[PDB]
């Protein structure tokens, strides 16, 4: 999401999260959901318009920012972004750091993008929440992305967690749920400061995994728990390969050396396992000669 702050007291020492939509920025304007007061001699009463576009689907995958546009409102002393004069018709920016000078004000408004892309585990969940989050500047999606910061698991309806959840946990993504989304549905009209929505996501995550037999204590104890072992699967996606890598496994992807060198087959007279079955073991027992001894029992038998 986009945030602005400034040096000096030109924004009253406060930062602000800017959602998609339009703001009028100026000396004689009151801080509400669509106006930003910036007090300095050389800033016009109504000085600039900032327009933030809503995110595209691509940004969920690239981690790119919402397009940020600046128009100068025919002012006395002009507007610059990153030292470039804003012309008539304005300019648009897709960089993640903008230094915006209004007039001759010696202090710049500093706009920066904080990464936040939300993956959903369920298509009906995505369709219900996507428009809501997009209006906050938060890209969303279903498929795997390297720009994902948060992952929404389905209601753990007294049942097993999905591979998407297991994967998110392991790559150290913050796992959230419905209750945090309900919180986000609260905030569009609000004027709130930098990092306002992030810690609640971490609190949600920490509470989710507490007393939960689908999770161990941390990603750290799961990571490399199967080192020394090796496996094989059919047309492994790079995500499932990375998932198995994170468990410390040696992987051989296929389309006498597939059989006796490889300890088991992961799926979707050889010995086969699902990732779902592998997760059950990856939690269960204690040590490296215990939590990897039940997996070593399933191989010999």
């Amino acid at each position: 999401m986009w945030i602005i702050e400034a040096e000096g007291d030109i924004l009253k020492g406060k930062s602000r999260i800017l959602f998609p939509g339009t703001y009028i920025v100026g000396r004689n304007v009151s801080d509400d959901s669509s106006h930003i007061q910036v007090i300095s001699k050389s800033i016009s009463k109504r000085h600039a318009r900032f327009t933030i576009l809503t995110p595209s689907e691509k940004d969920y995958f690239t981690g790119g920012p919402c397009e940020f546009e600046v128009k100068d409102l025919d002012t006395k002393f002009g507007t610059k972004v990153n030292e470039k004069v804003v012309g008539q018709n304005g300019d648009s920016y897709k960089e993640k750091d903008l230094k915006i000078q209004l007039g001759k004000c010696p202090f710049t408004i500093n706009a920066y993008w904080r990464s936040m892309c939300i993956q959903f585990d369920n298509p009906e969940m995505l369709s219900q929440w996507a428009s809501n989050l997009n209006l906050l500047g938060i890209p969303t999606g279903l498929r795997d992305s390297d720009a994902t910061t948060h992952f929404v698991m389905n209601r753990q309806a007294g049942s097993s967690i999905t591979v998407g959840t297991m994967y998110a946990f392991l790559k150290k993504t913050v796992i959230i749920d419905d209750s945090y989304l309900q919180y986000l549905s609260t905030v569009k009209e609000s004027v709130i400061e930098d990092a306002s929505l992030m810690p609640d996501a971490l609190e949600c995550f920490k509470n989710i995994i507490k007393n939960n037999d689908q999770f161990p204590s941390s990603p750290e104890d799961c990571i490399n728990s199967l080192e020394g072992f090796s496996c094989a699967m059919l047309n492994t996606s790079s995500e499932s390969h990375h998932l198995l890598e994170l468990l410390g496994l040696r992987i051989s992807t296929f389309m006498k050396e597939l059989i006796s060198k490889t300890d088991f087959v992961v799926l979707n007279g050889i010995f086969c396992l699902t990732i779902e079955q592998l997760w059950k073991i990856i939690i269960e027992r204690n040590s490296r000669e215990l939590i990897s001894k039940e997996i070593e029992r399933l191989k010999y038998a």
Binding site: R27, N28, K41, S42, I43, S44, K45, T75, K76, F77, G103, K104
Partner: peptide, 5 residues
Amino acid sequence: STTDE
């Protein structure tokens, strides 16, 4: 208030 330096 009129804008200046």
